Amino acid sequence: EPGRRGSFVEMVDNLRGKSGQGYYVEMTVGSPPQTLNILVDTGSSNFAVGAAPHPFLHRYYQRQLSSTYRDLRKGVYVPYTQGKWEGELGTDLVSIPHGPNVTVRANIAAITESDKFFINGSNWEGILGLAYAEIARPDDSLEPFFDSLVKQTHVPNLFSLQLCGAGFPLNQSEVLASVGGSMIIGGIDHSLYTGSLWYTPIRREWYYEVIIVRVEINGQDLKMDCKEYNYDKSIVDSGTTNLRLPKKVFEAAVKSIKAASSTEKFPDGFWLGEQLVCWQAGTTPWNIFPVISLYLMGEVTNQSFRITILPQQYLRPVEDVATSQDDCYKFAISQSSTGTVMGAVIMEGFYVVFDRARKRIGFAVSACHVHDEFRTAAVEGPFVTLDMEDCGYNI
Amino acid sequence: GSFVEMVDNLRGKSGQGYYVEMTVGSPPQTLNILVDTGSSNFAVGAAPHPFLHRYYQRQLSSTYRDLRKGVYVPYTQGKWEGELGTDLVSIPHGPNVTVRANIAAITESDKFFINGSNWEGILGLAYAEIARPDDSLEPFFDSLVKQTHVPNLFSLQLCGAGFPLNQSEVLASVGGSMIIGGIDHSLYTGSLWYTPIRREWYYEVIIVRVEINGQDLKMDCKEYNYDKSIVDSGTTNLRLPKKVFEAAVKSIKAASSTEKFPDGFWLGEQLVCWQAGTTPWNIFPVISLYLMGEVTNQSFRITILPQQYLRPVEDVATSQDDCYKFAISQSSTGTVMGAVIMEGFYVVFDRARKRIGFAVSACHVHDEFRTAAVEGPFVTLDMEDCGYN
Numbered sequence: 001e002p003g004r005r006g007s008f009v010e011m012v013d014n015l016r017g018k019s020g021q022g023y024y025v026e027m028t029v030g031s032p033p034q035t036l037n038i039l040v041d042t043g044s045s046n047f048a049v050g051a052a053p054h055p056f057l058h059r060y061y062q063r064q065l066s067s068t069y070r071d072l073r074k075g076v077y078v079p080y081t082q083g084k085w086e087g088e089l090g091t092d093l094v095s096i097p098h099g100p101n102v103t104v105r106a107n108i109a110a111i112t113e114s115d116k117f118f119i120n121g122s123n124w125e126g127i128l129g130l131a132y133a134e135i136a137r138p139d140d141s142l143e144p145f146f147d148s149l150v151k152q153t154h155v156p157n158l159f160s161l162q163l164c165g166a167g168f169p170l171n172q173s174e175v176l177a178s179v180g181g182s183m184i185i186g187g188i189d190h191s192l193y194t195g196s197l198w199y200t201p202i203r204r205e206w207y208y209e210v211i212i213v214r215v216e217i218n219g220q221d222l223k224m225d226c227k228e229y230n231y232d233k234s235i236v237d238s239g240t241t242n243l244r245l246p247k248k249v250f251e252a253a254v255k256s257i258k259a260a261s262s263t264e265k266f267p268d269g270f271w272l273g274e275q276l277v278c279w280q281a282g283t284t285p286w287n288i289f290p291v292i293s294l295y296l297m298g299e300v301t302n303q304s305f306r307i308t309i310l311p312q313q314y315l316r317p318v319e320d321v322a323t324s325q326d327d328c329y330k331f332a333i334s335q336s337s338t339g340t341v342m343g344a345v346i347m348e349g350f351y352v353v354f355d356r357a358r359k360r361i362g363f364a365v366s367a368c369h370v371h372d373e374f375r376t377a378a379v380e381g382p383f384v385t386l387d388m389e390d391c392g393y394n395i
Numbered sequence: 396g397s398f399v400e401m402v403d404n405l406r407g408k409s410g411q412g413y414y415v416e417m418t419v420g421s422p423p424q425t426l427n428i429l430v431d432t433g434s435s436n437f438a439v440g441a442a443p444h445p446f447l448h449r450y451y452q453r454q455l456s457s458t459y460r461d462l463r464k465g466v467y468v469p470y471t472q473g474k475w476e477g478e479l480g481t482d483l484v485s486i487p488h489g490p491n492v493t494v495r496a497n498i499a500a501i502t503e504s505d506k507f508f509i510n511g512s513n514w515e516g517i518l519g520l521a522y523a524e525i526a527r528p529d530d531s532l533e534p535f536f537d538s539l540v541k542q543t544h545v546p547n548l549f550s551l552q553l554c555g556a557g558f559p560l561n562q563s564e565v566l567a568s569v570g571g572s573m574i575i576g577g578i579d580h581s582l583y584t585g586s587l588w589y590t591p592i593r594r595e596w597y598y599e600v601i602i603v604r605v606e607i608n609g610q611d612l613k614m615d616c617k618e619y620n621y622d623k624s625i626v627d628s629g630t631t632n633l634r635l636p637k638k639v640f641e642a643a644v645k646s647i648k649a650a651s652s653t654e655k656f657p658d659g660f661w662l663g664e665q666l667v668c669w670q671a672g673t674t675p676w677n678i679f680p681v682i683s684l685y686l687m688g689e690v691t692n693q694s695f696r697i698t699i700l701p702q703q704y705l706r707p708v709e710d711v712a713t714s715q716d717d718c719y720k721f722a723i724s725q726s727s728t729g730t731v732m733g734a735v736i737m738e739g740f741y742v743v744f745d746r747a748r749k750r751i752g753f754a755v756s757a758c759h760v761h762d763e764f765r766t767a768a769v770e771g772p773f774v775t776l777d778m779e780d781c782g783y784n
């Protein structure tokens with residue numbers, strides 16, 4: 001054996017937040033530096049910050065107060081089914097206090113209008129899209145922040161994320177004082193995980209796309225054509241709360257999870273991820289819920305590995321509408337019409353390494369994943385898997 | 396016997412299925428329903444689906460009755476999830492009656508519906524024994540016979556066009572006839588020969604001999620019915636048990652050896668094309684299946700042509716070439732006499748007399764040199780040993 005050292009102490013524990021409202025890191029923009037909390041999102045590629053008064057913002061980017069602000073004289077509109085924002089493009093000097101000790105000039109979308117984008121009480125005033133230029137708006141000519149960081153400094157083309165769910169509800173005061181995880185920029189900190197790191201290839205450089213080759217519910221093979229698991233794509237997205245699955249896969253998964261937890265009957269609203277379920281304090285029956293394993297393509301031909309999450313990950317802690325002492329949760333798995341989305345729910349069980357340089361994503365059991373005395377999340381391999389390329393979807 | 400009101404009431408093709416129009420609920424909701432002698436459930440899409448432009452809306456039917464029970468039906472080639480209930484059902488171009496029957500409202504599915512097939516449900520015409528969830532769910536035809544004076548029998552004339560039919564063409568073409576409660580003599584030529592329905596679950600029969608251009612496949616006849624042989628309008632191909640399939644393909648390849656085709660063709664996966672009008676029908680052999688007759692130690696045979704087992708398909712370039720796919724495939728669940736085979740004959744499902752009749756179809760495709768046939772009798776011993784137990 002050999003104890004693994006943590007070499008990026010300055011960046012360890014630099015995140016705050018939770019799966020339902022997002023995890024954020026502190027950043028500064030402009031001269032003099034204007035401090036803002038920014039949502040870490042591996043599912044988008046724009047660096048955008050509130051730049052005008054808004055009911056849910058306690059502060060925002062004031063371009064007129066920055067001597068280094070540069071106007072790009074271009075607007076941008078970014079709509080999502082669950083949120084939309086409009087902004088004005090420009091550039092300025094940006095830094096990450098608890099990150100690399102560098103300052104770079106990057107693109108910034110000054111949000112002037114928005115709808116259902118900012119979340120009341122989330123404590124963040126902007127978003128940091130860490131994905132590739134291909135999906136940046138208005139187009140791929142707007143260089144993403146991380147690309148600027150790597151091109152302008154000696155920071156390695158890699159970052160890693162340890163999102164830490166608490167395992168219980170956090171009130172407004174508590175979530176502000178709690179450590180929500182770590183975003184290590186330019187490296188891998190070995191104190192954040194246990195076991196070994198297993199890597200899956202980044203299929204294409206736009207979203208952080210990966211390929212799932214097998215799915216199990218408590219060891220039972222869902223037995224669907226693996227192509228279904230990646231229809232029309234599978235991505236790792238810290239900006240989405242739930243583990244989202246293609247309609248057909250969701251239907252098969254929920255049926256299997258229902259069967260595995262059949263000793264307890266839950267209302268349809270629960271399985272729809274709409275209503276919470278509660279149990280008397282400390283009595284949550286974790287053991288009746290199954291573990292979920294997702295097998296991912298490995299880097300070696302015909303080789304795969306699996307990541308296994310517990311209900312402690314897919315059941316999201318929520319406060320009872322009566323703030324009672326009951327322990328309540330919402331089912332954090334839902335259907336998608338845009339492919340599989342490995343959201344915050346899933347990432348909370350692992351330390352995820354976005355190895356841009358080697359076009360691969362690594363997974364390892366997180367040192368802060370919630371579990372019980374009987375089961376733990378896992379990352380195991382290798383397994384012999386054939387024709388994994390056929391699992392990928394093509395329009 | 397002539398049932399003009401039911402003649403030509405079917406549409407579709409072997410590859411996507413043949414369907415009949417039906418109505419469910421009050422007021423009547425019209426839906427196109429796949430005619431399937433290979434299953435026993437009446438199930439209809441009851442929720443939006445990309446392949447459906449209409450579906451059963453239970454909340455709009457005053458006669459809808461909820462049975463408060465679900466049913467999951469998974470097949471290797473398709474699966475559907477449903478909610479059971481009953482309602483009033485009718486067949487516009489069928490007997491002038493309305494009956495209350497069980498209906499599985501399909502709410503979820505996986506590769507069940509077919510894009511462009513034009514049908515939104517399935518009518519399982521087989522027996523209760525294979526009804527899902529169990530045999531307590533009375534099949535539609537059983538309800539029909541019990542509630543009306545309609546004779547316990549129906550006949551099917553599936554009509555293959557012999558060439559590809561595009562979207563608009565297949566909607567205007569007559570795909571055949573489903574005569575409910577009788578036999579229409581205008582749909583066939585020659586005599587009807589009957590084979591016993593071995594057991595009342597699937598429409599099971601017993602094949603006693605197989606020939607490829609007159610040459611005996613020479614296998615133990617039990618191999619032909621392992622683990623059963625059924626007449627299934629819901630399956631496209633003629634499917635044969637693994638061992639029988641391998642022997643048949645070897646023989647068909649040998650007979651058509653003057654022309655070589657890629658393995659993909661024989662796997663029924665890829666098409667083969669010929670310049671317009673030049674399909675070499677004559678190099679392909681006829682296939683004869685001998686069936687147990689109703690008289691002791693007697694059998695008869697049905698013979699199909701390549702016009703039946705080579706299924707017309709459109710070329711990727713929609714050229715003027717005449718293309719087809721090999722419609723004979725391997726099975727691990729017994730012999731399946733699918734649409735391919737039924738297109739050559741008028742098939743009578745004589746439920747009342749527990750037998751299935753075959754006669755040359757008035758709409759089977761052929762050429763000037765050969766025709767499908769139903770001939771007999773032949774002296775065949777120990778035919779009961781051909782059945783699998």
Ligand SMILES: CCCCOc1ccc(CSC(=N)N)cc1Cl
Pocket residue numbers: 019020021022041042043044080082083084116117237238239240241
């Ligand atoms: C859980 C935090 C909710 C914040 O809401 C977000 C977060 C990210 C994105 C970018 S698109 C994407 N990451 N799939 C859009 C919206 Cl509306």
Ligand SMILES: CCCCOc1ccc(CSC(=N)N)cc1Cl
Pocket residue numbers: 409410411412431432433434470472473474506507509627628629630631
């Ligand atoms: C050619 C049309 C294909 C439609 O697909 C069907 C048709 C019938 C059945 C019932 S099982 C059976 N008839 N052997 C199941 C499926 Cl997936």
